[model samples]
Target: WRHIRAEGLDSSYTVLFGKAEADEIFQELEKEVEYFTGALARVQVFGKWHSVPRKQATYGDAGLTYTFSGLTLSPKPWIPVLERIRDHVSGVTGQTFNFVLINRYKDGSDHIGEHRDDCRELAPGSPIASVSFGASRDFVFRHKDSRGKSPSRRVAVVRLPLAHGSLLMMNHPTNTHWYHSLPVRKKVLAPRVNLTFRKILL
Candidate 1:
């Protein structure tokens, strides 16, 4: 709803739904995971692909497929629960999205590493909208060129708390200039669900 200039990135955040609605959505999403059996990643550990702790799934209209990290995710037929959320996000952002990447973090230790959402599959310049539910977590951003251990060329780091039922919109060029992550915090004891809606070119 309002603009944010965190670390010079064009972004915004607002509560898109109330706690009660969030609770209901969260419950439904948790149930939907059961149908996505073995949908979790079989990530390569030194050569062999192994199942990772976090779970991921993708949904969209027919012919929409997303690939990243050398893994290709095909579209699953839209479900009612996800369709409702997609419609809500599309209406609020005034940007129609055809695909969504879902990530389920079961606990604190489950997290996403730093990365940009600049894949070629995405429609360039189109805004990416993300909705969060369940336990809140820190959403962090850093300059793309920043190194993990280097201090001489340290870049600005921005930390945003993504609360339950909240939405985050990243405008043009934000993904190009920044890399974002959901870091692991062993103290966090609850699960979190995130849905990132995007417009795909293919």
Candidate 2:
């Protein structure tokens, strides 16, 4: 955890404890993920397409998700298991999240690049609670200045070795100031699942 002594957004993260109940939920989620395997669609980012095939369908109306963009997930109506997770996050971060982006990383080779949740519909200033399960991976961070200034700076980073049933809450300004990435670990050979819960706005 770093202090708020810098010039950009201030962020905080927490590695939460998991619940045995989550095992059952994980089983259910795993089924859906496996049954619906290869269901994600690729999208173009910055004129370049980094295929992380995803599928999505809207649940709530406007004021719910303005541009629930970058999402491509087959709708899995909120089940009792997901509700339990929502409640857990509510209690942990003291914030309620409405939508979830669940991604299935087939193996250690799957990775996500550096990017911000700069979506206008994400209710700016809101926090994003990210939870990981199934495998351990490194989460890296790089620094950037907003003014289009000269060489960007890299600040303190925590290579979160998030393991099964781990939680990482990117509260407040973490998305705006710092960039986070999950690069493929060729050494690992297991599958991982990531669920990012958020509150969307129109």
Candidate 3:
């Protein structure tokens, strides 16, 4: 277990499973998960619509809906595989989650843009537990003040590689001050699956 820190960023990371275990889980996820299709597969951000580069799904308690990037995702009922993984994460972090956003990047080109986790439906002060399996990818953070036109003070950018079966706990206020993204890595060909368990306000 180790902490990754910077101004307004407080997070921890650890390899929760070895290679064999990660491989097993990754295989199981490929067999059991279902991703959004059609309209749900695309995103409407600001006013423009664009196709999502990766597969996306949401699972959790019944009737819970999570909205982000102009899309509203209603969670599918929890599956045994997801429930088991969620239990272990809760056991390790001591925080329970009612919703999870799953992202499957088929290869390096599939990626997510920089943005904070939308807080409107999130439980106040609750940390987000992120777990990854498959190819390691670079996760980056840039302070909010340093972005946009006319750059502000130079703050060191934080970068972390999320490896197979690793866990990253992003604490309160980290999202409030920084934006995170998984950029495209052209040389990698293997797939990666990432699950972010979240505590949502009822």
Candidate 4:
């Protein structure tokens, strides 16, 4: 059993789907990645040289910041594999998702900064499911409402090895009170693909 230890103020949950399902998702996403790569381009963030490449469509409010990286993402549209997984996720979570932010981290150089998924449109107590496929990486979480507390009171923190075909869920008031990030890798050579499924209330 993977002993999960709770630390700090992180209100997150993780479930490892069986190896078979994991492998299937990995392969499907792998093909989708190839199809997306040829059709997408990274667009520069508003007023910033940095770019957010993404090809996103929504079902509800669509929320905020679905930025796709620049010089990346050629969307192949939604595939059957992804749809199948989405159906399963919806069945398990009892929530229907409308938008998927597909992130293709080509290598160790690709990384995400500490940020909250607290878009106002995402409903105050809603949940977000983040799925990781491909290479494993360190996903870090930090408490946001620490209020200058030191390590002793340094909010709750959780670091999980986001292995190939793993699913991480953050729910409740977690987004309102915490931030998370996937740090850069120095030794990783393989690529990783991440999809964040979101529900936008109409």
Cα TM-score per model: 0.90, 0.76, 0.97, 0.73
- 85-170, model 3: which lDDT tens digit per residue? 99999998999998899999999999999999866888878899899999999999999898977777779999989999999999
* Rank list by TM-score: 3, 1, 2, 4
lDDT of each: 0.84, 0.63, 0.92, 0.62
Residue range with the least summed lDDT across 10 consecutive positions in model 2: 53-62
The C-alpha local distance difference test score for the whole of candidate 3 amounts to 0.92
Name model 3 segments beyond 4 Å from true: none
The stretch of ten residues in a row with the least summed lDDT in candidate 1 is 33-42
Residue-level lDDT tens digits of model 1 in 1-202: 7676855489999998888999999999988843244533665545766565688888888998888765677878889998998898888788899998888888889998778998888998998888999989999988866756664466668888899989999888899888889999899999999999899986
What are the clash counts of all predictions, listed in order?
A: 0, 9, 0, 14
**lDDT for each residue of candidate 2 in 1-202, tens digit (9 for 90 to 100):** 4333244545454555556744655677677543233324455666665446322222222345323235444344566656677788889778987877766676778777677777866777778767777778887766665223455654555465766777777766677777777888888887777778888754
Tell me the deviation in Å of residue 87 in model 2. Answer: 1.3
Residue 160 in model 1: shift from native, Å? Answer: 1.0
> Clash number for model 3?
0
What ranking of all candidate models by lDDT puts the best one first? 3, 1, 2, 4
